[PDB]
Amino acid sequence: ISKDFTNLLNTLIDGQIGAASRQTEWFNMSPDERTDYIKQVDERLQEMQQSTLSVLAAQHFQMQDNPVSVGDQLQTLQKRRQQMTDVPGTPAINAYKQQLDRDILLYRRQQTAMTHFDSTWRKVLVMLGPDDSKPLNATTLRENAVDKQAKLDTEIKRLEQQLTIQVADSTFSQKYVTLFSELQAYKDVNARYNALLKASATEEAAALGALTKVPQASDDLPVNISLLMMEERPGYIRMNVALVNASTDGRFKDFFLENGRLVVLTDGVLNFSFGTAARSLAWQQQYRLKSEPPSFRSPTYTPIRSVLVKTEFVEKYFANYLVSESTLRGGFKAQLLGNGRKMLLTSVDRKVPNQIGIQVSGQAPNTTITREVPLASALSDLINQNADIASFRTIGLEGFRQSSYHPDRDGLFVNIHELERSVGFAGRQYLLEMPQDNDYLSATPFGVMSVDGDKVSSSHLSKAQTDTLYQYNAAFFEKLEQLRSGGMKASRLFEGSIERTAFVQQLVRLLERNHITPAGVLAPEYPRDNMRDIKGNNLNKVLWEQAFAASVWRSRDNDPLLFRLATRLVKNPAVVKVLQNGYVQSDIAQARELLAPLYEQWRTRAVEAETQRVASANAAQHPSNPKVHVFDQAEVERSLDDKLLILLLTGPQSLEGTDVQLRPMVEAALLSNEGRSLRKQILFHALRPVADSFSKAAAPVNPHAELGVGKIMINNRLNQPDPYLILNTSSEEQAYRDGSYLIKDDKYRSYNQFRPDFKNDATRYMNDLDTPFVGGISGTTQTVSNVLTELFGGALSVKQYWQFQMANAAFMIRNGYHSFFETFYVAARYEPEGADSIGKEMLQMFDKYRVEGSKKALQGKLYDGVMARVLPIINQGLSAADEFHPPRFTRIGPRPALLGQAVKDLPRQGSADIHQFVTDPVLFAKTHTVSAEALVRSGRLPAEGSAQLVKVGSGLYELEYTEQSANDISSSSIPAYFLGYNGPNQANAVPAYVDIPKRTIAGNFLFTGTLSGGSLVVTSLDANTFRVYHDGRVNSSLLYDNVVMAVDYKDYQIAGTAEGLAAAYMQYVNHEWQLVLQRQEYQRDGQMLRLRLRDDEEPLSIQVADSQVVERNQAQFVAYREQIHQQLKKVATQFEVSISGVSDGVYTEGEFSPDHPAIAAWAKLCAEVYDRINADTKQLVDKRNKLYENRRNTIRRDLINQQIKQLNITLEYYKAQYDTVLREAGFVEQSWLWQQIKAKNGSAAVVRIDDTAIQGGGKQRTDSVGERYAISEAYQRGARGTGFSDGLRNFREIEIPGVDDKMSALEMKRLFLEGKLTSEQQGALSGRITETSRAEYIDKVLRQTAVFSEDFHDAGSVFDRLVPQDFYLSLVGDRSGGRAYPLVRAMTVALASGGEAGINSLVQKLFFASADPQAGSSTLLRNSLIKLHSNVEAVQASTELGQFGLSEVVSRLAATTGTSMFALNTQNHSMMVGSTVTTEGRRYYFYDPNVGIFAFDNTKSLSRAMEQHLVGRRLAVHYGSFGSKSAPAFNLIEIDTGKMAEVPVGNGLNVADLTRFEELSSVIGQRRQVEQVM
Amino acid sequence: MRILMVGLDAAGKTTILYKLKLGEIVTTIPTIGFNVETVEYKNISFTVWDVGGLDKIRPLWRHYFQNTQGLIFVVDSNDRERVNEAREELMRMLAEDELRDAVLLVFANKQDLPNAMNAAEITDKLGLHSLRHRNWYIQATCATSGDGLYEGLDWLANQLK
Ligand SMILES: Nc1nc2c(ncn2[C@@H]2O[C@H](COP(=O)(O)OP(=O)(O)OP(=O)(O)O)[C@@H](O)[C@H]2O)c(=O)[nH]1
Ligand SMILES: [Mg+2]
């Protein structure tokens, strides 16, 4: 709460950042992340107070010997409380009191229960006993049978009734507890009595014993009373079952709610448990009670499903198992369920009662033989019978979804969420400081951490040390507690206090001692390359190395080499030494698990050996000792492990004799992925002892100058063992004994023992490269790699070498022993001499990048530099389909690969409610959304097909074209006439049309892509047929004739806006067509967009065929135009411009054109009002950009931000208030022109029936064939007969005359735009086009994206940003080449308007929009780069200079003054290039959308780079450049960035609007929220 | 203490702001939109928002009401044609509940100009005496000389403590 605390935290943050070197756990945060970090700080401080200092108090107190007794638990605890009811208030004290209270409640209850149990047992034995004239004996009890069995039964019945009534009691109570204990006593004594009556004369005395044996020794509870203590509410116990993973889709064992019933997703689970733990292991050790064995706590860690279940079921089946008392049970029991099924019970633990392996099984439903089989549905129904339906829950489910999201990674933890999820977890143990030593030290409540170079230990605290530790730490936390509440007044940490600085000096080392640093807790979704991990390594680089290790080590490709190595290695005698390694003994145990049945057979062999040992010990000469007359566990275990080791090294082919009978199981095992994995993990561990055993001297073959010739500076470590990472993995409770201990050597100890030695030159060097660091330069890898020629017994090929060395590097990364670099360096020193050796280059490349990294972030350039050189050696034999390719490095986190093994294999049906829609379409459309999306991102739809609905949401349905025939109406589909999408250019005379009968028989509906700023016009072609037009011009219904139905822009316009959106279609209803208009909109929905009906007006409007529509609209349009001229006159007057002489010129002559004299006055007036407002706003645009720059500054204490929102609001007001006016003025003028042209020359001058009378801005516009093809393949204008789709369906079967596989993609595209072939032939040629295109894009560019980065680097570049390979505008066809023409037009505006920050923002947008392929924003972006393919305003923004050779291009750029841009618009592609000269000298830019953006200081360097790139690697020929192969000729097109920025891309967005610091859904939010609201 | 400094365009608001903050005359620099400065004076950090007074952005003034403790309304004493426009805007501002607790300091600026209205004449033309339930003050100033400005700040500081 206190602002002082918040400022103090901000202060220490700022200061610790200012102190940062490279490699630090602090880094600068987003101003949002700031608060989440501080929140987690506060939370974990509260956790410390409640959960560790409290148990420390329970040992500073309790120091004095109060009365202590295991029986007087209640009294012992009570006196411990009254000893301390005097103690001052402190949250740790309150937690201590409350813990003691809860344990007092539980033990009070239990002691009561056991008390009334004992009194009940005594009462019932008195009731059943004979008179005292005889001793209690079986004879008198048998004589009693006929009465007292019936008495027992009657009492049982009465008790069951009365207790079932009492279950209405709201909480456990003396009466409830009484009755329960009595019932259990009655049940047990009844059973014991009946057993006595059944006992034979030899057994009779034993059962009489069992009756007289009151449990009065209190050696253990009655089982049912233990279950009573496990009850969560009176009459119910909480059952749980633990998942492997949460199985929302059925991939895993699960138990979930399905259709109101609870349902186990799988037929049995080993992981059931009952109850809940009373307290943490901390409290258990504080009481020094027996701790429950960890095999209860170890077996699982993912979310758990649980519910209360009726106790009778539990006590019926599972009380047979659940006894904690060591009654011998086998591995299994099978229990008859009341439905005739079995339940199988599994001894999953040989000691613990209350965790259970359970399987349900029974007569398989609907089978020929009564085989018992596991049955999830049976268990589900039986539970639903025995469960309460209330208080089902999943524990930690969002915890998983808020920390792992999914099964995340095959590698070590990266943040505390992945640590706490890992199998190593048990409980979060904070550490604290023991500062009164000469220097500060860390202690647990039980002990101070002894530390040594080899060893980590604890010394248990004596009382004086506890008093020290407590008094200090408590004083600190008391001060902190004051500071949060009493503030500086209470805590006196005034801004000048030296105590304040000492206090912070303590807090900082506390916040380091626990890894509460930002890298510990932030766990962001998309990792900015600034952030660093918990060890200060770069985060994103760690993620990339993890994905690399996983991909490499999961490939099956190298295995024939590794197992050849193993087959040789296994013959060496030294391999036996491997078995006594400490770490080796971790993993052969897993082999004991995988091969369980064979392992059993082995042990059945082995137990013979004990017999031979005892026999030999007796056969030994005159045995003076049972010399080996004993079961030696270690001997047999050795022999067994040796057999398992041998069976792991040599393949299953080594199996022989009787074990071949089980060999098919072993074969099925070893060929699993888990088999291969283990099968190699034992190999690399086995490797170290043999390598060591040669002791061959070091002899690196490649020298290195920077770091000492002839030696290596291996190891390079400082020992600084982390106590937190040790204790937060499960050591043995021997640490917890309150006794001095030496901690285990777990495998992670190799991850946590070491830290970099900053004194060594090698450390300084590595920090220059800024690699990750892990355990220093790997002397182990040297020691191995020196002797590979002896391990394999012969020299390796450089192929074999690099194969082994990459497998080795993957193994090393997997176990956490070293970084990539820490291995590859010595690899490069040891790469064998050979014709393709490459380490010499790699070294020189390291040096080259070192002299850079000292100044700049390399962003992975090092890793690409290596892979560029390694990969063509690896893939040297393979087919391009079979190459290995690693995941690809990016600014955002590592994305999946796009090639080779990693991809190989790595219409919606719809609802019959179609019939309701047919039956009452008016009510349906009034109450349901009808969308059209699938009719946008499919081009070239058939003229005629089947249309169906698909449902998507509440009243939300989507249309789709489908392939299924409508003549099976059960296809959920109907005969419909499709209409293609028409283009958006207002100059278009040739619209998309289709003809449909009046009183149709063949089909009764017509559908089209979504209308947005255009019109659908229906005209009556004859007595029997309509022609429906999709016209891209506004007000088009005025232009056509015989219009009987139409929807124009005004009919669906949102008032006061250009925006509108509606679905329109036709229906054949009550024997007539009806024009049905469903007004809609896009709507924002949680950082996404959706469509919806417009709710602010009647979302639907309907027209039957009428005659007056033309008059009714036309009069309105005439008036509205007059009105808008009034509007514009008003606005112009408001800005003082003279409107004199501005009026409509009578249309005299000519075609439609912009800037026709008739409208020239209006156009001038628009232009002027524009210039006034543009000059006006530019001053704020500039000052706003200046303020964003200001806010970029690192040092700023605090907000300056609100000035940005205030300028934003001001400008967007201006846009909303005036842009609409100017645009509408343009529209009404264009509309009036088109109407005049109609009125004078007739509609046939203003609508044209077909495009073959080609005309436009000029007779040709010399658009690249590529461009004119892409336009020709993303709009439909005219019909598309079905053969086109048949061709696409059969394009490989079909034959096409005059075509062969060796035509260029260009000559195919050209011949296709000749249109001579049939639609089926055009479909087939199209398919062949896409096939050829993606085969070439693969062969030419993706396989060589690496070397370009280095060419641009060492040409001398000064800044770069790679761009996402993945962003596509269509899922079908050639995805690669359609995006270039709009992208270059966006990029050139971005660069001209916002420089490097704009380029960054735009590439970020593309990355996100490619990571979320169907998110709302990525949809909007796809729909907003389209509409830049053929916008005539772009031809207004152009001037096509001639073709030019590159040298001339360079000289022209050198000649330019001020910003200028040029496209090359090569015959099939468009690079962009240009210069800025404004400040910082002249920076020259180059941009190829297939690679990335680069910049340069000088034209010599620029030309040398661009030549190397375009001709040196022949890409100009793949792009079809003009002229000779050498010295290629390009077009160029002098884009005017001054005008292009203002082109509309629909929905009121200018290209400028996508070119801004916000997201698109942000800007649209601001528009909606300031336009429709306000 | 957050200070909103408003008034019609060309009044001298920026000149006053920089005479007070920097002790200098600067006058050709534009203001359209806003200026803000932090000015330490005695115990108080005055943040003075000098917001442009062009009529077409006068409707935006209401987004600047947040956490404002003081109002400076600057009128060109030599501008008789626009003094009632200033009055209308002042009264419209005083209607806003966000400013209900704001104290009001008027600077009658440009006392050096030949037809400059004085503090009392501005007080009468603006109807300041009619302002009920409002702590207000008017100071005759010449921004270019700096006369009256610190008397204004001193008053404002004493009212705000
Ligand atoms: N003679 C005289 N001129 C002044 C005085 N104060 C300001 N001026 C002049 O008035 C003109 C406008 O001053 P500004 O500070 O820009 O006034 P403003 O209120 O910020 O004007 P806008 O930015 O348009 O809202 C300048 O030319 C100043 O020289 C003054 O006290 N005496
Ligand atoms: Mg000004």
Short mmCIF file of N, CA and C in Angstrom, two decimals, chain A residues 1176 1179-1180 1183 1203 1206-1207 1209-1210 1214 1574, chain B residues 30 32 34 36 49 56-57 60 62-64:
data_model
loop_
_atom_site.label_atom_id
_atom_site.label_comp_id
_atom_site.label_asym_id
_atom_site.label_seq_id
_atom_site.Cartn_x
_atom_site.Cartn_y
_atom_site.Cartn_z
N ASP A 1176 -1.67 22.09 -40.84
CA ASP A 1176 -2.05 22.27 -39.45
C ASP A 1176 -1.58 21.09 -38.60
N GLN A 1179 2.39 19.86 -37.64
CA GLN A 1179 3.11 20.38 -36.48
C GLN A 1179 2.92 19.52 -35.25
N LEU A 1180 1.75 18.92 -35.11
CA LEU A 1180 1.52 18.01 -34.00
C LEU A 1180 2.06 16.63 -34.28
N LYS A 1183 5.66 17.08 -33.37
CA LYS A 1183 5.86 17.18 -31.92
C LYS A 1183 5.54 15.87 -31.19
N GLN A 1203 0.77 12.95 -22.41
CA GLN A 1203 0.83 13.89 -23.52
C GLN A 1203 0.62 13.17 -24.85
N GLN A 1206 -3.08 12.53 -25.17
CA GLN A 1206 -3.80 13.77 -25.45
C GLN A 1206 -3.60 14.23 -26.90
N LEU A 1207 -2.39 14.04 -27.44
CA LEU A 1207 -2.16 14.35 -28.85
C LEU A 1207 -2.87 13.35 -29.76
N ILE A 1209 -5.66 11.65 -29.10
CA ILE A 1209 -7.07 12.01 -29.11
C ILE A 1209 -7.34 13.24 -29.97
N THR A 1210 -6.50 14.28 -29.86
CA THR A 1210 -6.70 15.47 -30.67
C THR A 1210 -6.66 15.16 -32.17
N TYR A 1214 -9.52 15.04 -35.27
CA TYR A 1214 -9.45 15.77 -36.53
C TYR A 1214 -9.72 14.84 -37.70
N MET A 1574 -18.85 8.92 -28.24
CA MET A 1574 -18.33 10.27 -28.49
C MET A 1574 -18.29 10.59 -29.98
N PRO B 30 6.08 28.80 -30.69
CA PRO B 30 4.65 28.48 -30.64
C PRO B 30 4.28 27.70 -29.39
N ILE B 32 0.73 26.02 -29.55
CA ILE B 32 -0.57 25.47 -29.94
C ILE B 32 -0.67 24.01 -29.53
N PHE B 34 -0.06 22.61 -25.99
CA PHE B 34 0.21 22.73 -24.57
C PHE B 34 1.68 23.06 -24.35
N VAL B 36 4.02 22.60 -20.54
CA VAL B 36 4.04 22.30 -19.12
C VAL B 36 5.46 22.47 -18.61
N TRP B 49 0.55 23.97 -16.45
CA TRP B 49 0.17 23.55 -17.80
C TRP B 49 -0.27 24.75 -18.63
N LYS B 56 -10.80 26.33 -31.68
CA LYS B 56 -11.05 24.99 -32.18
C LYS B 56 -10.45 23.88 -31.32
N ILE B 57 -9.50 24.17 -30.45
CA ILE B 57 -9.04 23.17 -29.48
C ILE B 57 -9.46 23.52 -28.06
N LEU B 60 -11.21 20.79 -26.08
CA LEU B 60 -10.39 19.72 -25.54
C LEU B 60 -9.92 20.00 -24.12
N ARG B 62 -11.16 20.10 -21.33
CA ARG B 62 -11.71 19.25 -20.29
C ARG B 62 -10.95 17.95 -20.06
N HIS B 63 -10.07 17.54 -20.97
CA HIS B 63 -9.23 16.38 -20.70
C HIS B 63 -8.00 16.71 -19.87
N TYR B 64 -7.80 17.97 -19.54
CA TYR B 64 -6.66 18.42 -18.75
C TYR B 64 -7.04 18.79 -17.32
#
